[PDB]
Amino acid sequence: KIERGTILTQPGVFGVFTMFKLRPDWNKVPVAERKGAAEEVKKLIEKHKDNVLVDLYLTRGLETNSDFFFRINAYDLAKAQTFMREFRSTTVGKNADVFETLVGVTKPLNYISKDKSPGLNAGLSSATYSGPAPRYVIVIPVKKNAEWWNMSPEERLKEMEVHTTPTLAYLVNVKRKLYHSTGLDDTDFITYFETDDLTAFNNLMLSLAQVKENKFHVRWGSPTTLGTIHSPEDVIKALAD
Amino acid sequence: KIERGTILTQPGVFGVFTMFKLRPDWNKVPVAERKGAAEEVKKLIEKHKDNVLVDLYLTRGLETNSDFFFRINAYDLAKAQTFMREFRSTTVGKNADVFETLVGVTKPLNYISKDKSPGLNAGLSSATYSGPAPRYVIVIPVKKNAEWWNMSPEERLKEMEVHTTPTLAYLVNVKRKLYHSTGLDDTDFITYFETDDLTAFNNLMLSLAQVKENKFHVRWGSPTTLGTIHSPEDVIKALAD
Amino acid sequence: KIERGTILTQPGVFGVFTMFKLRPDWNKVPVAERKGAAEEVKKLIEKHKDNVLVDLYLTRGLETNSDFFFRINAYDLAKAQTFMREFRSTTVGKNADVFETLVGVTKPLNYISKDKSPGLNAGLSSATYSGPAPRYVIVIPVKKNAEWWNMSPEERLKEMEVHTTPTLAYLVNVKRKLYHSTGLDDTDFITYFETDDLTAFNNLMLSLAQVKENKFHVRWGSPTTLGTIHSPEDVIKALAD
Amino acid sequence: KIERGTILTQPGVFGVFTMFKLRPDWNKVPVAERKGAAEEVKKLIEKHKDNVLVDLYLTRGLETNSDFFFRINAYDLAKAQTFMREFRSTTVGKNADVFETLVGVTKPLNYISKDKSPGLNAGLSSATYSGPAPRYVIVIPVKKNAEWWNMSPEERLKEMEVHTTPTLAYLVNVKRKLYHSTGLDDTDFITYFETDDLTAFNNLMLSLAQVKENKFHVRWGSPTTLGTIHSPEDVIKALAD
Amino acid sequence: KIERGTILTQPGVFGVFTMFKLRPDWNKVPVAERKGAAEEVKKLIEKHKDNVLVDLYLTRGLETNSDFFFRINAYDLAKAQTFMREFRSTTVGKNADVFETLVGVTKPLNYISKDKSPGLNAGLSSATYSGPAPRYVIVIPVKKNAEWWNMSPEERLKEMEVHTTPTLAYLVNVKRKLYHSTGLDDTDFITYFETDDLTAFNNLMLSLAQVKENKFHVRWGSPTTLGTIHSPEDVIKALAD
Numbered sequence A, B, C, D, E: 001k002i003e004r005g006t007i008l009t010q011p012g013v014f015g016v017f018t019m020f021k022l023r024p025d026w027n028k029v030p031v032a033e034r035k036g037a038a039e040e041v042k043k044l045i046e047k048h049k050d051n052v053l054v055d056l057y058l059t060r061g062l063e064t065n066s067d068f069f070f071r072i073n074a075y076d077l078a079k080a081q082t083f084m085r086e087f088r089s090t091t092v093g094k095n096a097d098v099f100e101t102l103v104g105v106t107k108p109l110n111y112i113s114k115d116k117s118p119g120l121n122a123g124l125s126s127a128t129y130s131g132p133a134p135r136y137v138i139v140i141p142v143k144k145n146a147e148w149w150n151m152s153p154e155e156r157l158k159e160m161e162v163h164t165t166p167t168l169a170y171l172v173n174v175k176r177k178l179y180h181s182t183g184l185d186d187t188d189f190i191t192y193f194e195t196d197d198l199t200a201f202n203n204l205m206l207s208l209a210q211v212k213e214n215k216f217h218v219r220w221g222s223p224t225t226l227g228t229i230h231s232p233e234d235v236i237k238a239l240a241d
């Protein structure tokens, strides 16, 4: 069994973000098969109720290299693979090419833990998202250079302490999730955000762009994917027409 | 209501620039459907009269990677997405792939404000385009490095006063708009220009090329998109034949 | 005569990794010919029983630029070429495009030999892979800068003693092979790994990212290819439906 | 009214270089339709007699990303666009994709003028190409870094005095033209050469690679395009069979 | 009249390497029109007996961006262009795309000449290949940065003497030819090697990776193309099934 509330909260959970782009011969799939496409994803998601957690986002109209993207969470990478492999046999699956994939895994806190930084940690755990259900999702893969990794844990802590300080306040505004990827894919992290206030999201990044940590990014985006939040079937219904 | 005068002047407005390139199988769409294309787009813009402001520009013949491109203003990002999504269902939308998308948001003045640089700010707001209606649009994404962002807001202000000084002069010549994107897309800024004097515009960029601020750019173009200003139906009427 | 146990163990063995991505018109091959494509690969591999050693891995659903990939080991690169060349004339072969090829050769120990680093040689050669038959494969090309190659062998040795130290604890966890490539292809090394514990593997790579040697990487990934271990016939069966 | 010798000599002239690549489906336009492609171009050039000056060069067999490319000179970038747009409606235009476009504008001398550098300006102005009519063309876009641009006019002049010293000699061999692009496209300059001696031309670039100015180049080719000079109809005749 | 022993030995000789990749619809050419395509290439080469020297190498199975590549040598670049242009009119030619082209020209010795470096120059000319017919070809484009070219010829000579000292030994083992490209394409040099011993050749690159000269390379491969030597008619016969 796989419960949303738990799997998104736990360490050892594999995140698989996959960005698809619809090929032009999709508008030539017969309106009938295309309308029936949504139910098919919905049943596929149900059929794996117990193997993976599925999220699906709409980026068509906001992104060059994707029309929609999935966020799979799984206790087992192989199972996230099997879902995706089966998704690609779907009617929509057979009509979209993959433009991005990011594999990461969840871990315990490395810096702002109860032990190491109790002060900021109390802040982080007891802060609570306010106001409107988030209409937008942002996914940003982030990779830091060899210099970063070769600083001592004390120095890296200091800098993550600096990361946390202006950002804790945006927790009323923005939901966050951090996956780890070094060794597993071509990035060090995958970050995932949901927010209703894009102006606030901009200011949040500017905050972080402005601290020493930013000096070690060799990837911070590329792509920065920002699309819009819906139910799996709605995304597909919107792709259809 | 979305008044062109107001929406282009206020903060918190989203710009979505989208560069499209026609596929070769557009020449094989029946000269009939193709000529009906312009009206279809015109009608679409009318339907969305009240959700977004639409601009369309012709780059075919001047750009490797776009035949035409839209500028969308919205108070709601989701609404820009809806329009664009509906554009790509159109006859022309169906025969063009996306080659670039930039999402950005309008903000208040950060440096050359009434508070921070009163002298320059006055020259700025009391400067006024003179002469022939501009025929040319240039759009330029700009990203600055971590080192810039790690400068003190005092240091960056001084640099931006340096940016404003030799450029005020070109406000009779060149119209400008600034969008902010850090965290929203793969750029710090989206800059937008209308001019009738390209040689002037060349001198303008050289001016800015020669100051310290330039030292921090990691993207300043790529693509630099210069195309030609027309009414939306006219852009589509030119892609017809 | 080619025994798996010997050829994977010996110096002067050529490795050729080739990532394939299936074209969309494979979904349009008659489902009958697609199911028959597995036996075909299986018979070809029997055909070169004595020419090459063949492994094949499933990356569909986990990788943007491959659905599958081969590892060929041969005593003679020409025989590797024939094999690969004959595969591409196979039914699946005719429906996939090559997206990456790494050519490499197996060499004797340059650094952590018994002569040069006795103590760590002992460690490495004594503790053995325990733990479950590995489900995951990882393939990482690595290339170091000219600064590295210009350091004295005495300096590079010290650096590789520092690489070795943290890895010793993953000897029960992770299986490794190293091919050499400088001058034969666009990388210095091809690294190959098999594991069942991806979190462990992530930890390993973090340990490596954090030593001085990481300072010299100009390539360490791109792509980092991670996918799944199965019998060649099973991989092609997996691609069929 | 547009005389070749005038427009190639004057400031304020727009250059539009466009490198085209024929698609496979051109070898399947019937020979007959393909051979009538040459007159269609020839007739388009005569049609635009008074709007633009057209040059066409053969690159097939010599360049990966072009079979041919145009050089258009205009007093009006808008008129370059129109011509280009109309060429792309041509039989040949319908079977080729654009792969590079460079926009630029002619200016007066910045450095080696009569005022600033009288000695060298004399030497430049009073020198004239000798011997066999040039068979080869080379087009090379150049971009210098923020550091170049932040040097003083005095420092930059010294460096261009350095550029000009070893190159004057090659004016007996090589014809040149200098377009300016900063802010108009993704390059600072577009340089244009005609020669019959490629070994000379090679010695010319090495002369230039060897000086300080070459230290600030961030683009200096890419693509370096070398092809062969013919009348416009002769270029389309060649591409036909 | 073009003699292989002579043209490969003389200065002022144009080299034009071109890497081609067969398109998927080549498997749909009726086998036999395919096998008969070798005859066509053979005839084209004899038709150009007097114009160019032709070589053909098989890379299918070992390279991502080529199935085969040509080496053309000519006294007149134009004639190489005609040859190539006429090859692409060929049956195979109509089914392949070009993925790479390098143009360059033979020159007299710059560094290791009797006058400048008398001893090594003697060692060079009086060195003679033993061992089997080479099976392998490698083609490596090399570009050095502005810092190299800004070194005085004294300093560069020293460095080329350093390149040449550990490499002479490999002349019994490996065959080399050096072409010059600065200004003619997007590389400083094209290097061409024929060997039968690939472990040797790896060791040869590492020798050269480890000298100061390597510090100045900005391109040294990309692509490193290693393929398999045969007669022209044999390479096409091979591409056929």
Ligand code: HEM
Pocket: A108, A109, A110, A111, A112, A113, A124, A140, A142, A160, A163, A164, A167, A168, A170, A171, A174, A176, A178, A189, A191, A204, A205, A208
């Ligand atoms: C505004 C809400 C945010 C908060 C409260 C926040 C807080 C944190 C905290 C507490 C950590 C340390 C976790 C640990 O070590 O266990 C962390 C790490 C990290 N954060 Fe954020 N962050 C926020 C926004 C962002 C944004 C906008 C980004 C940009 C993409 C980002 C990217 C990252 C990355 C890549 C790491 C891992 C750093 C490392 O590997 O050492 N965060 N963040």
Ligand code: HEM
Pocket: B108, B109, B110, B111, B112, B113, B124, B140, B142, B160, B163, B164, B167, B168, B170, B171, B174, B176, B178, B188, B189, B191, B204, B205, B208
């Ligand atoms: C010639 C007329 C121009 C004038 C009067 C002008 C003025 C200004 C001013 C006053 C600001 C600061 C606004 C603020 O922070 O609130 C600014 C910002 C900016 N300008 Fe311009 N500018 C001009 C042309 C250009 C050009 C040609 C470019 C090149 C694309 C450019 C790029 C930018 C960028 C990227 C910013 C944001 C800088 C930052 O993030 O701190 N401007 N400009």
Ligand code: HEM
Pocket: C108, C109, C110, C111, C112, C113, C124, C140, C142, C156, C160, C163, C164, C167, C168, C170, C171, C174, C176, C178, C189, C191, C204, C205, C208
């Ligand atoms: C975890 C188990 C590992 C062990 C026991 C191990 C051990 C070693 C040893 C002993 C050598 C020296 C061999 C020689 O000089 O002959 C070596 C070289 C090398 N290793 Fe690993 N390593 C491990 C994991 C990794 C990982 C995760 C990577 C990164 C992908 C890696 C990359 C490399 C590379 C690129 C070289 C060649 C270094 C050079 O050229 O000088 N190893 N390794």
Ligand code: HEM
Pocket: D108, D109, D110, D111, D112, D113, D124, D140, D142, D160, D163, D164, D166, D167, D168, D169, D170, D171, D174, D176, D178, D188, D189, D191, D204, D205, D208
């Ligand atoms: C031997 C023939 C050449 C001569 C006589 C020559 C001369 C000059 C002169 C006099 C200038 C300054 C013009 C001015 O500032 O008003 C100049 C500028 C320039 N040249 Fe050449 N040049 C030659 C060949 C080349 C070559 C092979 C290149 C390489 C592509 C090149 C690239 C450029 C560029 C990019 C500029 C503008 C520099 C700047 O913006 O400050 N030139 N050349």
Ligand code: HEM
Pocket: E108, E109, E110, E111, E112, E124, E140, E142, E160, E163, E164, E167, E168, E170, E171, E174, E176, E178, E188, E189, E191, E204, E205, E208
């Ligand atoms: C082992 C056999 C080799 C020998 C005997 C050899 C010898 C030489 C000599 C004598 C020169 C200078 C010739 C002149 O200046 O006119 C030269 C230049 C050069 N070699 Fe080699 N070489 C060998 C292998 C290689 C290899 C493996 C490479 C790697 C790609 C290479 C790359 C180059 C390049 C790029 C140059 C031109 C340097 C420059 O432009 O100034 N050589 N070689």
Ligand SMILES: O=N[O-]
Pocket: A176, A177, A178, A179, A191, A192
């Ligand atoms: O720490 N936010 O991924």
Ligand SMILES: O=N[O-]
Pocket: B176, B177, B178, B191, B192
């Ligand atoms: O700051 N001009 O967008």
Ligand SMILES: O=N[O-]
Pocket: C176, C177, C178, C179, C191, C192
């Ligand atoms: O470094 N083991 O590939």
Ligand SMILES: O=N[O-]
Pocket: D176, D177, D178, D191, D192
């Ligand atoms: O400066 N030669 O274009």
Ligand SMILES: O=N[O-]
Pocket: E176, E177, E178, E179, E191, E192
């Ligand atoms: O110097 N070998 O090309």
Ligand SMILES: [Ca+2]
Pocket: A062, A063, A064, A223, A224, A225, A226, B184, B185, B186
């Ligand atoms: Ca984006």
Ligand SMILES: [Ca+2]
Pocket: C184, C185, C186, E062, E063, E064, E223, E224, E225, E226
């Ligand atoms: Ca290669």
Ligand SMILES: [Ca+2]
Pocket: A184, A185, A186, C062, C063, C064, C223, C224, C225, C226
């Ligand atoms: Ca990957």
Ligand SMILES: [Ca+2]
Pocket: B062, B063, B064, B223, B224, B225, B226, D184, D185, D186
């Ligand atoms: Ca442009």
Ligand SMILES: [Ca+2]
Pocket: D062, D063, D064, D223, D224, D225, D226, E184, E185, E186
């Ligand atoms: Ca070229």
